[PDB]
Write a protein that binds this ligand. Sequence first.
Ligand SMILES: Nc1ncnc2c1ncn2[C@H]1C[C@H](O)[C@@H](COP(=O)(O)OP(=O)(O)OP(=O)(O)O)O1
Ligand SMILES: Nc1ncnc2c1ncn2[C@H]1C[C@H](O)[C@@H](COP(=O)(O)OP(=O)(O)OP(=O)(O)O)O1
Ligand SMILES: Nc1ncnc2c1ncn2[C@H]1C[C@H](O)[C@@H](COP(=O)(O)OP(=O)(O)OP(=O)(O)O)O1
Ligand SMILES: Nc1ncnc2c1ncn2[C@H]1C[C@H](O)[C@@H](COP(=O)(O)OP(=O)(O)OP(=O)(O)O)O1
Ligand SMILES: [Mg+2]
Ligand SMILES: [Mg+2]
Ligand SMILES: [Mg+2]
Ligand SMILES: [Mg+2]
Lengths: 481, 481, 481, 481
Amino acid sequence: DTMKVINDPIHGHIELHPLLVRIIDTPQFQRLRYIKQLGGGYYVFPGASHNRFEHSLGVGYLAGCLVHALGEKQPELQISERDVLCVQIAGLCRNLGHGPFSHMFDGRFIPLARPEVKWTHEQGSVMMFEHLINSNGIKPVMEQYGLIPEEDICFIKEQIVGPLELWPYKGRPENKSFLYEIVSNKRNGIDVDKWDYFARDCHHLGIQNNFDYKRFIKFARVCEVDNELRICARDKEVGNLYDMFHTRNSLHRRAYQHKVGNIIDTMITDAFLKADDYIEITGAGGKKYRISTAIDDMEAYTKLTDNIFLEILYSTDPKLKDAREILKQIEYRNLFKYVGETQPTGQIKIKREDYESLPKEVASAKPKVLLDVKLKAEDFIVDVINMDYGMQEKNPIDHVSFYCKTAPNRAIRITKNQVSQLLPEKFAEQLIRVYCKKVDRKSLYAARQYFVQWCADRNFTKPQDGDVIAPLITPQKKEWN
Amino acid sequence: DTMKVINDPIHGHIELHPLLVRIIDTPQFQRLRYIKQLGGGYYVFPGASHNRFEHSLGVGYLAGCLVHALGEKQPELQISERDVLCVQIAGLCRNLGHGPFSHMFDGRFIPLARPEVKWTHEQGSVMMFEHLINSNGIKPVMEQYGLIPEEDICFIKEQIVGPLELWPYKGRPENKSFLYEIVSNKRNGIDVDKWDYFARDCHHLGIQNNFDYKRFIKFARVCEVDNELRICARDKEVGNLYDMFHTRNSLHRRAYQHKVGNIIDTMITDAFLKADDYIEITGAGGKKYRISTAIDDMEAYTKLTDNIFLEILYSTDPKLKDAREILKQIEYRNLFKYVGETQPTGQIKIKREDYESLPKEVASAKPKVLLDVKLKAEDFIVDVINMDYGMQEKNPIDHVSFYCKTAPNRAIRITKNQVSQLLPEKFAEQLIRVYCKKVDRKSLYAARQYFVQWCADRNFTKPQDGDVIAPLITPQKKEWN
Amino acid sequence: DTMKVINDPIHGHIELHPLLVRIIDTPQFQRLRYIKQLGGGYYVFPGASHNRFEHSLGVGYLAGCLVHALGEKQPELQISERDVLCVQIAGLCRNLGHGPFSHMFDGRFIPLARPEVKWTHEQGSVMMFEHLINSNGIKPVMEQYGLIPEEDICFIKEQIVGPLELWPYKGRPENKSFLYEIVSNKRNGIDVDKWDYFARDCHHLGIQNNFDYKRFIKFARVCEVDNELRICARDKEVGNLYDMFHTRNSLHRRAYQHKVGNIIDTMITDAFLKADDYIEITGAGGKKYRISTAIDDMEAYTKLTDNIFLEILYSTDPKLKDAREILKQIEYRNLFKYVGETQPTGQIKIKREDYESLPKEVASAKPKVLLDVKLKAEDFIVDVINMDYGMQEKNPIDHVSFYCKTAPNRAIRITKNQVSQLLPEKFAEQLIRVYCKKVDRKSLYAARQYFVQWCADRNFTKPQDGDVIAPLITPQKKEWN
Amino acid sequence: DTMKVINDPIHGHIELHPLLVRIIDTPQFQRLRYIKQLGGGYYVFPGASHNRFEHSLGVGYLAGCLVHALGEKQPELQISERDVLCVQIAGLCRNLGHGPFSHMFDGRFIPLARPEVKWTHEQGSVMMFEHLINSNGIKPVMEQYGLIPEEDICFIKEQIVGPLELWPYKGRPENKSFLYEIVSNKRNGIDVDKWDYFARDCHHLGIQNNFDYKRFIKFARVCEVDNELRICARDKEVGNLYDMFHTRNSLHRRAYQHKVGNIIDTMITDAFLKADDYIEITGAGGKKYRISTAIDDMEAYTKLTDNIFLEILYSTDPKLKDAREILKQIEYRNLFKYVGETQPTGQIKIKREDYESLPKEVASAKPKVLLDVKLKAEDFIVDVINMDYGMQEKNPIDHVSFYCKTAPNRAIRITKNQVSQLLPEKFAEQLIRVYCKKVDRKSLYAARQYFVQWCADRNFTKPQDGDVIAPLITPQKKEWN
Ligand SMILES: Nc1ncnc2c1ncn2[C@H]1C[C@H](O)[C@@H](COP(=O)(O)OP(=O)(O)OP(=O)(O)O)O1
Ligand SMILES: Nc1ncnc2c1ncn2[C@H]1C[C@H](O)[C@@H](COP(=O)(O)OP(=O)(O)OP(=O)(O)O)O1
Ligand SMILES: Nc1ncnc2c1ncn2[C@H]1C[C@H](O)[C@@H](COP(=O)(O)OP(=O)(O)OP(=O)(O)O)O1
Ligand SMILES: Nc1ncnc2c1ncn2[C@H]1C[C@H](O)[C@@H](COP(=O)(O)OP(=O)(O)OP(=O)(O)O)O1
Ligand SMILES: [Mg+2]
Ligand SMILES: [Mg+2]
Ligand SMILES: [Mg+2]
Ligand SMILES: [Mg+2]
């Protein structure tokens, strides 16, 4: 029509369709300029200033790229301009539901603040998309470019959140099933969302990315699998897919789960919880919401961003003193002190309901040394991190379909033994990090003794620095010697 | 405390001395995390999310690099750990005085809001440095690492702003003159500050940087010039310096003075001006300041960042409706409309006192064409932009000293004719951009007719699109052919 | 056969059509793996190992990109798959005629070895393309993919060399004129060939490129200019084009005309000249050719690459001793010694026929100092380098057509004065570099005295290091001081 | 006479000491400009034009970096300028022994040509270093810069090849043990050689590198481990080291063992074997050597490079017809055809003595498919590729020492279970690739049936494409269904 050109550092010159421009140029979309992609990460990696907004353009752009590519290779798929635009729109909009500091909000804050509700960024994205549509008169614009809003909005939301609830989708039929594998791939997780963040986060973080999305796209084809058309990878490229999940895991270990970044996320959460009663956000009809209740009114949620942090930091209301103090502690780098890191053994798993009980456990361990300070449950933070290949215990590569040079229309499967013996044996594990809220040297030492003792007690793995931090405790455990 | 290692995307792994960590970990320094480097630029270049904070670490790092390098090549300079630390500190701190949206604040807002006061980021940086020092008990830490606060604080501020009041400096004597040429080079402008921003802005903007600071540093030496020790470049490398200023010009043309970015800056300024009476920021002793008066109290200025934008945007105060509306217009992409761009001719220059009178001039032109809509002065914005090589009319390369392979201690001068005939004739020009506040089709057409007529009237250059936008007006002027 | 995917460092994953694969997979094309892009450059820039082969794939790929892009925006152009393939083929093949060490061969060797012949890489490329086609049965394969060999081969050669010989081309008609502006743009020089080399050479050289080809392509349109369809740039993008030529100039100053690289090129040439009688290359019908006569037989030229250097280096024939010695001198880094660099003044220019007379002139200058050695003409090399914007004295931007946002189908012109006063006044100049073949310290000093005297004599510019290398000579000339 | 600066694309501006320049500027060193780093890799990865020469400068530069860094952190190590220079020299020179096409020579050609002798690049490097030293009068230059040639040359060779002769080294004593861990790390393989090639190969190959050597160096310290001084990593960084080996394995899978690159290596080897009797290279005293015997005379080996390929390709000697033909087949892309790829199962391993018997085994399998063509042993190539983490069956991280934030001088050990459950179970495996030398469609089909049958017979893993290429063979094996 008249394409708008945007210069992205990761993707270069992107073209945006007028319809996408209209969706972008709304308060609900522009809100994402005020939400850091990596949350507390930026307080550790000074390069990670980037916000969800730019990620969103990238995801939208990549969605478009993959759908166009599948189109050009296989006209028999009958992919229409209508289909392309919906995949683009879903890509653009699948981050609409992120809250202040991204993962912090949906990962730490809302679980603690509103444990009765179950909340996901996906649900938020659907709701906010709905709000964006209705507040900005998008439906006629969609119609103007040949979209059918009733069906297409369904399709778009399904891309975002999954089956709305044996074919479960209502936005498109089975012959178009592959379209659901682009923006948010519930089948195996190979989706353009990941591709943008691997590239963009790395560009910002200052750590370089091993994975080539352009290659993946060139080698992508659609084939029949059990009477559904699905996206297939080239057989010989399976190694690259294993690599992709490895890359995801690396970025977690190096950046997204960084020990200090996590604590900063935790401290911001603590502050928000303490501020929750006193901060007001005005939603629909002038009705007032809290940080924790903004998820209930999309008009209010529109105005909930990283700005909440500075609203607290700059406040003078005495009621907000407690929250303000925690943020000040963050500024002076008076952070909770990292004690150590350990893992469960065998397939012992620690469920979410047990998280609360863990600080108590550490405080209750009885190391056989004299300690100048005695510490209590409240003095300890235990952070449990699930590291997996995106499908709990399962190997996502078992959920990928492949094709061979010699027969491109014929989908096959490849098992782990068929690829390499050097690949992981398991695909999920847990990290336990322990910090101490008491910052002084005497407290830190004591915390370490409790911690290493607790590790021994529960038959967790030997802390890497165990012999150094707790020389008196490590000889007790036979396995460690 | 010992050395902190920080991963920067531009520079890789930087080391920060404990003393620099102490300066960084303060409200006054951390404040820079909340100020966008390129201001409104981010609303045009979605990559340009970066803030002054990260730039500052880079500038500090680069300052350290150059001073260390000079040290290792020339021990005769007697550069001490004390010297290095001060150059690092100056580098770290020469952005402390930046206001919300960087250049917008000191370039547009303060000139309009407080025309009586004369305000520079440099002055702000000195003041905020002072405030940082005094609020955080830095002086004993400086002493602990062998600095002499009285002299060294002087040295640091002099690096930031220039002579504080025949050798004019009091922080260091003549034999150390070259130290003043690293962080903020008043002699010719080749300084590490530029080097960081060229690299970092490019990384973010998605433009590619063609200038090599590491090469410059390798080839840098200190030589005696008229009984002062100054930083000299290798003769052969002069072409690279011409290139460096060209690069600066390119970044201005392409990014920093982008027509839409400038308008967004302008609209944000307008909003702030309209908000100025109602937004209140608490400074020292609970005393209240306005956006325009925060520069008077450093405690208040500490809390003045990009956050002001969102404070306005999210306000419900009826008094703030006007300002809030402008920001909403920015969000809906209802911007002032670009009319055109022109320049003066010959030696005609446009003085600062005449800026106000220019909208009136455009509205007063008599196009000799029938118009359905008539426009007024207030419907036009005229932005005058000075593009120069950093030294007004002068060629900064004439203020650089060089040395030869054959005699490394002997400074020479190189003239323009000695380098290339293909270099610029002049080193300063002006751009005049005109926008119209009336957005509709009929108004835009009219604005163009006035504008092109005005250009003709004043013997400005023919707008590039003159024949297209104003076909009736362009034939009048003979010079335009 | 379907698409072959090839992973290029600059361009990422390229697709090659089966027809292109067939052209590539021939001795005539694979020959380009054995010819360094930057010739002697690699002996200065250790990164510059790249060969013409890879450049060729890139130029082919970019040709395809531009033609496809024009196609997608403007179906009214009626661009066919046939057209695309021919543009691709031309792009792929316009380096086929390069000789050993690239520019060394066509720039230094053939002019000296065969002054009667006029030889260009373009002519060579046409000839070699013809040989490739005929030796490998390409014409039927072309037909198989819907090319019409008679017309299409003509089109391809015309793209490479210009009109083979008021519309001069026979491969396509006027309505398709813009196709001639892609691979080798005789009109203004903005062509994909440059785009690949800017990107690739920089990647290898370790110097970074300022210019964005992908942006150019996004903003490219075809418009009617004087009843021909031509490629037009967007008005506002003119600044970028001036930048492009500046970039070209920079790469010449920094890399392609580097003083040592040029001498190495010169020494290699000298060696080849001395080896010319004794090296034999077998051509068509078992007939034998020399380095200098291989351009006469394409079968022999096929076997003429950088390999001749090592054939000489490794030779034991006493007849080859002289040539072998020069190459050995290159290996021991016993190079001709750089004396200095100067330029003409005003409009005086130095014609190609006068190059020979210049060594004599330097040797004949009478500096008023006592010298222990006296030097002769043959001891001096004078290298004259033309640096220009690709169209001799002319400004190539005067040969570019533009379009405006408001009227995309309407081509306009933009003059220099309409863009910036900071742009170059002239577009062509000459560098004179002088080296001395006598390497010892006494000879070097003497050579400098002759040289600086000669500069004075001819009213050339003062060498940058004049006061250092020749302190006795420089005071004589009033203008210098 | 003084320091050379050289611009490397990977490392930027390197400084080279005069002594290093003298070593570089010799026929023995310059020879490495004519040996492709990745051998046949360039015929698959068009970017991989780079030669051993440039790699060598990088390895030398990085060696210098690590030794300097250890120096600056720990002056108590007593590292001298002498030590630095020797580590630089070893780094610079540990590729001197590479033959034409690098790994082709030492991996395929010499094993086949001279099975009686055991030959390594390391041994070649030592010999060539000796030859370089003696032919170029380096010993006096070494003395001039404060080296003691007898001791230092010993040290240098020991760095390259291991103990020349309870402390086994004679070049330095135990207190300097860590110096042996920089250039060629026999303990665990973490050496600067790898660091350069990861960076450089990636830069050229067009794959991005996910390992950060600069980070490693910043975190490196020397500690006492069992009364030897060793290079230790920070505890927290162990995950990065696991990543490093994973990256090495990826580069092997993706680039260094690429199926086509390996075949091209194999074809070049075949050609050389066929050329071996007729190519003559003149060594010391005019005595004549063959490709296979050049390793016996360093004077001859000096003149043995990639140039042998082109000597063959351009030859007219009828005796060389057979070798010439194979190279011509490479040019026409008439390569031996990839049949398939398989692995052993469980801990079954395939002995080196059995490699020769494997083609026979494939030819002897009796597939139940109807075939027009019967193939013989000589029609099949069976390539067994050992992929491991550089220490056979062993995990190199078990051979790394670590230190903790809290006690930097105290080395500890970290086991696999202490790091992650998602790490590899084994650290060595085998790939079996089969090609067929008969190129035609009918032969290829037959070869596949033999191959998949052979796989079944020997209880190898099911080829990835087994059910597609050999549908008639695959149902026989129960395990595969
Ligand atoms: N010269 C440049 N080089 C690189 N990127 C640029 C340049 N100019 C602008 N950009 C970036 C900024 C934006 O992300 C994107 C849009 O480009 P630009 O043509 O400036 O848009 P615009 O909307 O101001 O132009 P138009 O006048 O056609 O509306 O490209
Ligand atoms: N694995 C990694 N690779 C690259 N950059 C990293 C990695 N881990 C952290 N970084 C970045 C983030 C920070 O800017 C910087 C320092 O990281 P890190 O050494 O983990 O700090 P830290 O303060 O947590 O460690 P310590 O235990 O030494 O106090 O480097
Ligand atoms: N995993 C990889 N990642 C990046 N580039 C790769 C990878 N594998 C190969 N390449 C490069 C090498 C070549 O330039 C290009 C061709 O890819 P590749 O798939 O290896 O071709 P191929 O011809 O060997 O396979 P096939 O003929 O079986 O499809 O991509
Ligand atoms: N302007 C440049 N920018 C980047 N790299 C450059 C530039 N000029 C040269 N190089 C590269 C080429 C070589 O790798 C290295 C050495 O450059 P250069 O300074 O020209 O040495 P040189 O030996 O010719 O100078 P001199 O002999 O006068 O010291 O840097
Ligand atoms: Mg998802
Ligand atoms: Mg400045
Ligand atoms: Mg050209
Ligand atoms: Mg090794």
